[PDB]
């Protein structure tokens, strides 16, 4: 009976996702980021009479909120040291030890792309309907952290520590989520852990100095 509300929610998620993708400054990036999170909460808790669905939506909010903490740390550092929040001045700050912003962006990407440590919301969060599972947690929403890192790749290339820990984190989460996907019975759970494994593979590709291959795998996946 709420098919119109369902379609409107999907449209709102698409609008927020395209805002997040095409945003030029980190504030608009954050608008798209958190709008994607909120529409994810609603679409996971679509059947609001289901307690398990409500728990899944709440824990997705929790893990994405820890990612938001990392995002806010990066945003605040960039505001304090480059008074624009815009990617052009972010480019102009490419060689001044961006360890704190890159660590914050890595935490944000871990939260959104469900790497190890902040992973289980992605497999838990498809007790909602299957088109929600598909569009949200298989093609667009979970890409967002990897998209953030490929957006900040020119800063990323000058920090070897961030590249190494991205490679290690991505390898760990792709191995662990493939292991979890091996002995699973729910089809949605199998494809969710497969999605997490491919996101870990994109994180590995970002651990190398190849962001463009990671974005190619984003579209392909």
């Amino acid at each position: 009976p709420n098919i119109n509300r369902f379609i409107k929610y999907l449209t709102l998620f698409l609008i927020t996702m395209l805002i997040l993708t095409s945003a030029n400054n980190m504030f608009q990036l954050f608008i798209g980021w958190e709008g994607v999170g909120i529409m994810s909460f609603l679409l996971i808790g679509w059947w609001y009479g289901r307690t398990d669905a409500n728990t899944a939506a709440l824990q997705a909010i929790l893990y994405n909120r820890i990612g938001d903490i990392g995002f806010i740390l990066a945003m605040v550092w960039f505001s304090l040291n480059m008074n624009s929040w815009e990617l052009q001045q972010i480019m102009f700050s490419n060689n001044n030890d961006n360890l704190i912003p890159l660590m914050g962006l890595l935490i944000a990407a871990t939260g959104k792309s469900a790497q190890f440590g902040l992973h289980p919301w992605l497999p838990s969060a498809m007790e909602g309907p299957t088109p929600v599972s598909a569009l949200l947690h298989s093609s667009t929403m979970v890409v967002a952290g990897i998209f953030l890192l490929v957006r900040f790749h020119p800063l990323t290339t000058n920090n070897n520590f961030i590249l190494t820990t991205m490679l290690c984190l991505g390898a760990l989460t792709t191995l662990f989520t493939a292991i979890c996907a091996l002995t699973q019975n729910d089809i949605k759970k199998i494809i969710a852990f497969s999605t997490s494994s491919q996101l870990g593979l994109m994180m590995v590709t970002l651990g190398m100095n190849q962001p463009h291959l990671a974005f190619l795998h984003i579209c392909t996946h």
Partner: protein, 178 residues
């Protein structure tokens, strides 16, 4: 879900519950139908060969070690039916099960949209209002002076009245009100 549990489960009930749970977990392990039938026949043979004991303590010890074995080698992710607790689509349509007293709060325009239904609903409300007093009188007359009272309810004893406390389960929402 329709019968209230007693004070305790008898030994026969506990054995039957263990048998059903063991067969379900056995199916979850051996997915394939022929393999499941083979091992289910083996499990039935084990229950049959421990069936006749004539010693309550020995039977209880057998049941205890069988439950120990079940918890030792149960399936960590067993098969759960949909519309069953723990499975997918368990409480899915609770968001659509509207509890039917909101029709009292419906506007006269909305009631005018469905005239025959609301005439039948008014007839049902009149029947409930007329039957409530005899329901209460029968429940008071039910012989429960002190002590052992179970959660069961009596039927309509005399001719012409209704079973007590019938409304909340006769007029419950449909399992898929879509």
């Amino acid at each position: 879900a329709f019968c209230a549990p007693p004070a305790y489960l008898t030994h026969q009930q506990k054995v039957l519950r263990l048998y059903k749970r063991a067969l379900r977990h056995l199916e979850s392990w051996c997915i394939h139908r022929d393999k499941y039938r083979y091992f289910a026949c083996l499990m039935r043979a084990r229950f049959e060969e421990h069936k006749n004991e004539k010693d309550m303590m020995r039977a209880t010890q057998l049941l205890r070690e069988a439950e120990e074995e079940f918890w030792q080698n149960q399936h960590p992710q067993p098969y759960i039916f949909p519309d069953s607790p723990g499975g997918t689509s368990f409480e899915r349509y609770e968001c659509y099960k509207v509890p039917e007293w909101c029709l009292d709060y419906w506007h006269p325009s909305e009631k005018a949209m469905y005239p025959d239904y609301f005439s039948k609903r008014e007839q049902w409300k009149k029947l409930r209002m007329e039957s409530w007093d005899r329901e209460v009188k029968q429940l008071q007359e039910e012989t429960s002076p002190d002590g052992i009272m179970t959660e069961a309810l009596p039927p309509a004893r005399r001719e012409g009245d209704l079973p007590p406390l019938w409304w909340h389960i006769v007029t419950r929402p449909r399992e898929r009100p879509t």
